[PDB]
């Protein structure tokens, strides 16, 4: 137990995910003995595997792993290069672990590239669940599934920071705290279109609030009914966003400021 390794967590159940960048390009057998080699201890791969061109396994001992991030630029293959070792601190070899793979980031990324445009700062993400290129490719960027949206809002501050018209229309997203940041990540964005998305309340826009818009949408989002007139759907919506001028494709009276 304690001191050396308590039978339970919070204490010393310390896991590690050691990743050999490009491991595939080497023999599982050769590659590993070559580590133990340049190594200083006896390390055992806790379920090694291939994530595309990825080489990775787990390590229980905190310091075992320690002597592995020590073996970097250490091995020199036949091609005469250096095999790498991305060593990290982690969770049990199988837990809640939701996330995704980096191959897909490049998936999601390429898909977006064709769905963008640098003359209208487009970002038509009509059906990120339904778009060829990935449709029938086992994967589906489920934006409402938190991280996906995260990793989606990721590519933007990275590639397209200036974007002006993002469009989630129809991606059945509901609670907005996921993308509750694009205000920072995607600064200008003078337009949006959270239409179709099963948004039940106006309590969402409270999350985009700071986003300085001028054009939005929202039909088919439960919240519609949660309203009577138009005078306030124009006052609730416009509340969260004053500079608002257009809306759901119609004539929004010249916003009269006091």
Curated annotation (Swiss-Prot):
Q: Which domain of life is it from?
A: Eukaryota
Report where it is expressed, by tissue: Expressed ubiquitously.
- Residues annotated as domain RRM: 15-94
Spans of repeat LRR:
162-187, 188-211, 212-239, 240-258
Q: Where in the cell is it found?
A: Nucleus; Nucleus, Nucleoplasm; Nucleus speckle; Nucleus, Nuclear pore complex
List of residues that carry 3'-nitrotyrosine: 22
Free-text comment about domains: The minimal CTE binding domain consists of an RNP-type RNA binding domain (RBD) and leucine-rich repeats.
**Job description of the protein:** Involved in the nuclear export of mRNA species bearing retroviral constitutive transport elements (CTE) and in the export of mRNA from the nucleus to the cytoplasm (TAP/NFX1 pathway). The NXF1-NXT1 heterodimer is involved in the export of HSP70 mRNA in conjunction with ALYREF/THOC4 and THOC5 components of the TREX complex. ALYREF/THOC4-bound mRNA is thought to be transferred to the NXF1-NXT1 heterodimer for export.
Quaternary organization: Heterodimer (via NTF2 domain) with NXT1. The formation of NXF1-NXT1 heterodimers is required for the NXF1-mediated nuclear mRNA export. Forms a complex with RANBP2/NUP358, NXT1 and RANGAP1. Associates with the exon junction complex (EJC) and with the transcription/export (TREX) complex. Found in a mRNA complex with UPF3A and UPF3B. Found in a post-splicing complex with RBM8A, UPF1, UPF2, UPF3A, UPF3B and RNPS1.
Query: What's this protein's family per the entry?
Result: Belongs to the NXF family.
State the name under which the record lists this protein.
Answer: Nuclear RNA export factor 1
Q: Organism classification, top ranks? A: Eukaryota, Metazoa, Chordata, Craniata, Vertebrata
In terms of the parent sequence, the fragment covers 105 to 362 of 619
């Amino acid at each position: 137990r304690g001191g050396a390794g308590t039978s339970q967590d919070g204490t010393s159940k310390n896991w590690f995910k050691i990743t050999i960048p490009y491991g595939r390009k080497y023999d599982k057998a050769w590659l590993l003995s070559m580590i133990q080699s340049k190594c200083s201890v006896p390390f055992t791969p806790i379920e090694f595997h291939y994530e595309n061109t990825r080489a990775q396994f787990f390590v229980e001992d905190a310091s075992t792993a320690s002597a592995l991030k020590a073996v970097n630029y250490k091995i020199l293959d036949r091609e005469n290069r250096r095999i790498s070792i991305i060593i990290n601190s982690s969770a049990p070899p199988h837990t809640i672990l939701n996330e995704l793979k980096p191959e897909q980031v490049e998936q999601l990324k390429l898909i977006m590239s064709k769905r963008y445009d640098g003359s209208q700062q487009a970002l038509d993400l009509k059906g990120l669940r339904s778009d060829p290129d990935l449709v029938a490719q086992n994967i589906d960027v489920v934006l409402n599934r938190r991280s996906s949206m995260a990793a989606t809002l990721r590519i933007i501050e990275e590639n397209i920071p200036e974007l002006l018209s993002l469009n989630l229309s129809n991606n059945r997203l509901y609670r907005l705290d996921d993308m509750s940041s694009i205000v920072q990540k995607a600064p200008n964005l003078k337009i949006l279109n959270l239409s179709g998305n099963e948004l039940k309340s106006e309590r969402e826009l409270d999350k985009i609030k700071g986003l300085k818009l001028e054009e939005l949408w929202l039909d088919g989002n439960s919240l519609c009914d949660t309203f009577r007139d138009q005078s306030t759907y124009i006052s609730a919506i416009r509340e969260r966003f004053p500079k608002l001028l257009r809306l759901d494709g119609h004539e929004l009276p010249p916003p009269i400021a006091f």
